[PDB]
Amino acid sequence: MMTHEENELLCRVEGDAPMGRLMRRHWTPICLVEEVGEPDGTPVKARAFGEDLVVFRDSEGRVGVMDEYCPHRRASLVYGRNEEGGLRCLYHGWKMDVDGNVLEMASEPAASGMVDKVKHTAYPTQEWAGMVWAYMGPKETMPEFLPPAWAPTADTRVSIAKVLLPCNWAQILEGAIDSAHSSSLHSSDMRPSTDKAPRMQVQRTGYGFRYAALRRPLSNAAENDYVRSTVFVAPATALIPPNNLYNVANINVPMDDTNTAFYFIAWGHPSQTPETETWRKFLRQTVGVDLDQNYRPLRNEANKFWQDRNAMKAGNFTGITGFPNQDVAMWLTMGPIADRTHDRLGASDLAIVEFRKQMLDAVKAFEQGAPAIGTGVEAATPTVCSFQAIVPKTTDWRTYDAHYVWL
Amino acid sequence: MMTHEENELLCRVEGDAPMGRLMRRHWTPICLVEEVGEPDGTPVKARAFGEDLVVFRDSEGRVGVMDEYCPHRRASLVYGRNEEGGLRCLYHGWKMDVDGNVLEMASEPAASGMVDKVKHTAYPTQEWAGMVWAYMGPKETMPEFLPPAWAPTADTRVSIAKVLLPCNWAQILEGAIDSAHSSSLHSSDMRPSTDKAPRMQVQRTGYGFRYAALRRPLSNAAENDYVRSTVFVAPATALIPPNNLYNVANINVPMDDTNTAFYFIAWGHPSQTPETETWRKFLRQTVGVDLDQNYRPLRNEANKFWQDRNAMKAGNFTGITGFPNQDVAMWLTMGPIADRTHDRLGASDLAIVEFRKQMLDAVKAFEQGAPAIGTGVEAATPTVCSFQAIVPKTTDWRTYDAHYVWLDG
Amino acid sequence: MMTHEENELLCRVEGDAPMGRLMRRHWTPICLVEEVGEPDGTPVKARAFGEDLVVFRDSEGRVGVMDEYCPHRRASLVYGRNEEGGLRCLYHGWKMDVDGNVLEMASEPAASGMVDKVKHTAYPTQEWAGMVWAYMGPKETMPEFLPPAWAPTADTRVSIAKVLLPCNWAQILEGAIDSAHSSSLHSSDMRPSTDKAPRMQVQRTGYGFRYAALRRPLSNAAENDYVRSTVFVAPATALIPPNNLYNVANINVPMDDTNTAFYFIAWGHPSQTPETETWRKFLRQTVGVDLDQNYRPLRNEANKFWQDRNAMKAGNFTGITGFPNQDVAMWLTMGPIADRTHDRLGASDLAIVEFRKQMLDAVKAFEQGAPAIGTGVEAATPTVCSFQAIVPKTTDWRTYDAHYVWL
Amino acid sequence: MMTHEENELLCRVEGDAPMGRLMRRHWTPICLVEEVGEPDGTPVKARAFGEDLVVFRDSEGRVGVMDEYCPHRRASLVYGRNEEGGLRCLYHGWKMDVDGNVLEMASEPAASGMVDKVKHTAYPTQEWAGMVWAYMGPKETMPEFLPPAWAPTADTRVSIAKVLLPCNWAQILEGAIDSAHSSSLHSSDMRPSTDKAPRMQVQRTGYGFRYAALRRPLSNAAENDYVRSTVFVAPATALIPPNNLYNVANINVPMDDTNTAFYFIAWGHPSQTPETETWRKFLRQTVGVDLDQNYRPLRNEANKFWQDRNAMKAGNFTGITGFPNQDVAMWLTMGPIADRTHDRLGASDLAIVEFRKQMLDAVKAFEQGAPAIGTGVEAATPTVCSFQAIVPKTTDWRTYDAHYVWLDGQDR
Ligand code: FES
Ligand code: FES
Ligand code: FES
Ligand code: FES
Ligand SMILES: [Fe+2]
Ligand SMILES: [Fe+2]
């Protein structure tokens, strides 16, 4: 049984919070590449770990991620002019480059003490797989940026739905490591199985854990299992089981203690992996249709996530369209921070139990001096993958030589 | 560098707050005269210093400013019947006059002495320069109402834009004593200088301070300065440099700790000064177009103050229309109470630093029992004015004998 | 100069108007396959040549295209129940199959054999390339359905934007055979040339014509021509010059005399050709963003097609987003039926002149009993293709051996 | 098969049109009582047979129905002041009484000979059964006003849904003389029968016709019939079969050739008949929810009458809420004026066939000088009533001694 205090430790990320300090030891997505446009594009507002950030791509094509508020008198830089190699605040014309250097102050003299040497909070960035990433941890702790398990290479197609969700990251992450839920919630959105009650096994690792959900297959149940294996990559990534054509990953980024940037990714061979808008349409996460311009969902508690009771009477399980929308209805109705003090977990919760244990330990150990889970030598790499396959009851799923879906 | 505690002391006005108590030693604008209409007109809701007020113009034409909540069981009087010399609560028919006497209790037997016992809290009021004013301090401290420096007399055209802004008053006031910002923020809304970096000087006074921004003028920069002088009139009024035709003033009234009634005033000779709707259209502060019926801006953070990025690519500096809306975008994005603990000020902030020093000092002194800054003998006058002028480098600006713009210059 | 009577002959299609009789000798797109759904799906409203149609996919997966009004008392069958092998009107329960046989009249005695005697107007249909096609000509004139030039085969990716436009088809058609327009209208959306004034050459065929716009190339304009060839496929199809990756076609179907279903198609090899939603987003034709649910544009004359004057001052040519929406602005402002009586045509209009001449000749010939242009032996095939290429000055562009783009 | 010319003759009512003339020989509902308010109430805009009307209740409680446009320069009197025994035009202050007499002209010299010489077109009116009625025919043809069949007495509860529909009156009327439609269209809205194909029989009368829909009952089907008898009262009223508690009638007033005021009425003993808002909610014809403030439906073609495809997949027949909205979807999708030249009518259409033949004869006869159908000693009275009952096959339904539903199971 978790305690109130453990819940807080697990979930809070703003400012002081140990869990944030840990998370900030990993490279984090801040926003989509598509949001920042061309050189001199419109500046973008973002939010990670309780901090408001401005993101902008300068004349040379470099992407900056900085504190949103001007270093001078803290007007929002989102309104500023992005040109001639920096972002210029509207108010008194201080201009910053993408590394946070103040290149100029319109109403100030000279250069030696205030003009150049003043440095606006700004983080290292990278662009990869359709996202802008930043390292928001102590600077001297920044590792080399390496390909995530779900975007191994410059030629993988990566297609992203982003949805800003008004609840804490941990209940969303839990929903990616919860194989049984597909067999209820997603049962109108379907495998060689109808088994609703899979056996769970978890293998902890240095970066998180891998787990397998074992279902009785429709044929030769005596002989084999339907294995679906998911990878938990700490702090807040799941590699969930692929389909026959492409892979699927979830990364979640805490905007603050009660909001999360949810990224749902189709990835694989370009000829077998949907493009962005196809993927969004399939998921019902189309900007302008399912989401507003800020990728916030139009489905909400007051319209019951557009649930359709007549669809449900007709045999549609949830009456909610777009399987992630079905997920969201469940997560948001748990409240801004799910109260895990009131859970009644079961066999199906095994990987969620492992998540809670592992992450609580990892944050206490980190606070006492260990490496942040999944950093340095520990890291997951693209050798890590989820998969699904009919497997011999006498083969160890943990040693099964599965690779990501390609060609 | 201010502490959190100094920032609280400067900014908070509600209830006890020292700065509220200081500010209430001065007559305060409550709402526009336009809002109260005619005798027996619709009652108006206002808020000052964290109090909800009802304002109304009775059958004899007198304006009352009173606590909004009925003294019986505290239903809002804003819904009541304004007629026959009083405001009558709908609920049980208690009727108050402009001075908060209860004239009548519809359901109370004249038997009891109740009707003459209850007095509703109501403030002394004045109407002047198109505003309803009230005196919200301890009554025995009420001074004679004298004209503001920006409304000298009955023959002055005074044209007002009112905007209710969801931030704290002090960040708004600071935006009025901040000469350098025009040269960036308002650069597409232009004077005989292209100088963006004015050198600043202040002269402290009994009622606040005057400051001058000096810029190199376009011609004869060798021997002359372009002097723009702004007057800070404590607690929260800036006489901003005039143009060639008319004067510009700003008075800010805290509605509470995180909201302010902003009044942006064109005043001068009628023949040279725009009318109200012309001024509002010029500033894009038109009720029904830029503002709702309560004078709240339709521009906001969610719509990004209607900033148009294509206009900015085309060369417009802020892509925001109406110069005060460009100011508002900056003030509001600093958050409901700007955190000055995080400022990094520079040369261009000298008046703002002065303001913080003087007001923190004035509030401390006032708590210790000194008179509230700018009251009694020390009060600003119509002779105090902002000014703009090409001035010889050998003339001390503090010495320039300026008058407020009138006719012919 | 065209006369009023020639303008009407060319443009009108309702009733027995000869041009509509001519067009109905060709298999015609009625709606997209994506509107009709699964077996027993929601019936769809369509309109072609002045007739309101209902389209539905029955329980066996067959598509019907039928007069919209019930043959009983003419209630709309769009509201009917699509199930159990047919479409049943709500009012008295008459049930039709996709061939317009009445299977049952809920309320009629079976004895007075009326159920066998009543047939409902229903048209032969075909599904191909993501569209539902019908043959709306006299029944015995129905030709074998062959693949159109832009959808050669079952392994071609065809991605379709559909827009319902409130003007007559012919002006929309003309817009696809008007090469010089790209060099103005679409100048901010572009090429091997900045020649704004192409010289024009046309070659008539039995199914339409091909033309070439010849531009001065970026140099070697002494040696070469930059050739873009478009193919007019009568009556209302334009195969437009490819890009280096995929092919583009336009087929327009008159809904009536003043409205047109506009189909703008990307087609080619699946790995080089965008998916539907990608195509629609590129063109700003996304349902729910640019279009309402009936595929009508939200851009219109009262909102000036969302023309942004600020973008124009910043150097964007039109201030209108999505190049087809730029064309649409121009077409709809010419009025419901463009008044060709008041054109002042120039050299750039040669292909438009050919079209006017050929279609007026075609329909005049057809009234006197000539086979409809482009039917039978003369019909365009996938060997007929548009192209674009530098063409050393000394070659007949007419002899150029282009194929569509594939890999 | 009707001709185009016969369709036009049956349906058009504006101005000269003979059907318009025929219909105007009957007292006509113009609006609901509840629209006219109290004395000095807000003037009401109404429209019958192609004329725009203003309706107001004056200071003394009387109701006027008059040409909407001021007799002076034709400004709308709907905007005028209703006070001091009259309606005064805002423009130049001409003031008219409910009889159309000009009481005053604000700007005309007191003894300008013009005052008591201008008469504005104003019709005789009657208030009854929660409606304002007017006599819009030639004044010397006006008959005494008698109770409608469906509102026999001052003690009767009458509850009305009014809906302004954008189609011609005749296709709406036909919808009420079409027993078979209920067994399909209204099959999710349901009786001692599941028979979908009633046998039909008609009995012509001097005011219209009665018809009987005969279905096999669910018990003793070989001996007994379930009889639903509807009465058509010309020109545009149907007394529809009652239920066990109360009575149901439809009166339709053409607003012009392509718009119709539809009144749908529950009536009977006050303790057995729902109140107005009850009835409206049940039918989904509530103002502010189903209808705008002018009683126009928010359900339309563009939103497919809010047809819910999922409800249909779950087994609801039409996916449209409130049985009249189901009717309306069918009527309006036939077009502003249904084209009867393209019908293919079967046995179920017998009452509609009869209505078409009867009303085309009546308007032909009338145009040539016969009395208007259903005027005079010929008038339907409250003795005429629809009914529903199980009846032995050996009994003639024409003979069944029906009375309108009243109390318990006893007559009135
Ligand atoms: S607040 Fe940004 S430059 Fe002054
Ligand atoms: S609350 Fe105001 S009179 Fe009672
Ligand atoms: S109108 Fe369709 S079955 Fe009667
Ligand atoms: S128009 Fe009515 S009084 Fe003149
Ligand atoms: Fe899920
Ligand atoms: Fe400003």
Ligand SMILES: [Fe+2]
């Ligand atoms: Fe074009």
Ligand SMILES: [Fe+2]
């Ligand atoms: Fe019905």
